Design a protein around this ligand. Structure first.
Ligand SMILES: OC[C@H]1O[C@@H](O[C@@H]2[C@@H](OC[C@H]3O[C@H](OC[C@H]4O[C@H](O)[C@@H](O)[C@@H]4O)[C@@H](O)[C@@H]3O)O[C@H](CO)[C@H]2O)[C@@H](O)[C@@H]1O
Lengths: 216, 213
């Protein structure tokens, strides 16, 4: 389908810089104005910047004026955001979205999935994955422990198992590292027959783990 | 800069009823007001543009109106899938979102299903033991978890996490993780998780003996 794909997020020190990109496919990129919209942890959506279809009108939220620069490359169907002098308030998930069709009408019904920007001095650390082993209905899961920064994604059976899955929000431990669990409830009779594997992916540290959860 | 003020901040409404959400701009934005639904884990979804025009595929139970500074969204025949944060957004002069209204679906009371998980042997190799207690599919959100180690009440060594409201059955789930050193974990035998919730006749305890089964 129509798609926007953000990339370039990661950990950067306060005062540092980063360039985000947003690749468009499935439509005439050159026909649409584009916006960056962010969501800081525990806060609401905040519009950041916009560049019209032909680059004639460019806008910024006041708190990023002089620090961020939006641009586009129609030949590469790509939108960019150069983020300088990064502050803690810039820590957020960054979405790209179309806004207007040319100068005719507001549309803004196509959004990306977001890329995560973390403004921190701390180091990147991949998680450890431990099984939460089962003991009519059974429960099992995976413990994803001691990673930085957010986020991690967890699937079960490579996305085949979705019903009954609860992946918890991460908690910040006193160590400064994050930890979460993903659990699933399954029929107790299928424990010896069906195989259960959590698929943990922590992109910032290039960690991909497939853990088998079996009865003890 | 235009200030968008949304009210109420939070809302808890049972399936089938209706809720009205309010949005105010600090100066006139004419009709350039949009409404968005944002479910946790998904990208925002446009509901309304032009103050009163449903976006493509949005059902008639989403109704928007307003002009100038005052706007409302009314959501009728509310369903469990409507659990989300709802934002207004002015687009008369660039773009500004309101702070949002978090809509919870007030389903009937549901007691937690409680499970306890001992540390894996693999984790004990690292020198830390994580004991996890799971409270599954309960409503309302408020629940108390107490850890007992050899009948000694624990304090300060646990952390809780609550899921977002389930879009299908409107329940919550909660995990409490007890963290101990391997040395502390191997000193004791009985590890217990005691759960209190309004849907339970009496507090429920799930426990295990270290090294058994
Ligand atoms: O046209 C769609 C395209 O425009 C942006 O959104 C519009 C935006 O305008 C706010 C004000 O900016 C304009 O002022 C600058 C004007 O002067 C120079 O000559 C040119 O750079 C430019 O034409 C003024 O016209 C506007 O009042 O805010 C609204 C957002 O909904 C749009 O009207 C982009 O976001 C969009 O892609």
């Amino acid at each position: 389908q129509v798609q926007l794909l953000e990339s370039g997020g990661g950990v950067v020190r306060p005062g540092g810089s980063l360039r985000l990109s947003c690749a468009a496919s499935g439509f005439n990129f050159e026909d649409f104005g584009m916006s960056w919209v962010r969501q800081a942890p525990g806060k609401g959506l905040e519009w950041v910047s916009s560049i019209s279809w032909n680059g004639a009108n460019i806008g910024y939220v006041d708190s990023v004026k002089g620090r961020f620069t939006i641009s586009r490359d129609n030949a590469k169907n790509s939108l960019y955001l150069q983020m300088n002098s990064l502050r803690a308030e810039d820590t957020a998930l960054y979405y790209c979205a179309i806004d207007w069709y040319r100068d005719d009408y507001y549309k803004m019904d196509v959004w990306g999935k977001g890329t995560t920007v973390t403004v921190s001095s701390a180091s990147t650390k991949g998680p450890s994955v431990f099984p939460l082993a089962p003991s009519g209905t059974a429960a099992l899961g995976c413990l994803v422990k001691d990673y930085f920064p957010e986020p991690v994604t967890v699937s079960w059976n490579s996305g085949a198992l979705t019903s009954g899955v609860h992946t918890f929000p991460a908690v910040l431990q006193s160590s400064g590292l994050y930890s979460l669990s993903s659990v699933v409830t399954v029929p107790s009779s299928s424990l010896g027959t069906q195989t259960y594997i959590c698929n943990v992916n922590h992109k910032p540290s290039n960690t991909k783990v497939d853990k088998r959860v079996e009865p003890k | 800069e235009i200030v968008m003020t949304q009210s109420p901040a939070t809302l808890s409404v049972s399936p089938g009823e209706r809720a009205t959400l309010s949005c105010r701009a600090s100066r006139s934005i004419r009709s350039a007001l949009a409404w968005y639904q944002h479910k946790p884990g998904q990208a925002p979804r446009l509901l309304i543009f032009g103050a009163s025009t449903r976006a493509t595929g949005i059902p008639a139970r989403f109704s928007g109106s307003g002009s100038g500074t005052d706007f409302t969204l009314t959501v009728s025949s509310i369903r469990s899938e409507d659990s989300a944060v709802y934002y207004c957004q002015q687009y008369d002069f660039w773009y500004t979102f309101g702070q949002g209204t978090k809509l919870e679906i007030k389903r009937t009371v549901a007691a937690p299903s409680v499970f306890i998980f001992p540390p894996s042997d693999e984790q004990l190799k690292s020198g830390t033991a994580s004991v996890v207690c799971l409270l599954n599919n309960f409503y309302p959100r408020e629940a108390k978890v107490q850890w007992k180690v050899d009948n000694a009440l624990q304090s300060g060594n646990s952390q809780e996490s609550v899921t977002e409201q389930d879009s299908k059955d409107s329940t919550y789930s909660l995990s409490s993780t007890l963290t101990l050193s391997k040395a502390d974990y191997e000193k004791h035998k009985v590890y217990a998780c005691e759960v209190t919730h309004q849907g339970l006749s009496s507090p429920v305890t799930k426990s295990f003996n270290r090294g058994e089964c």
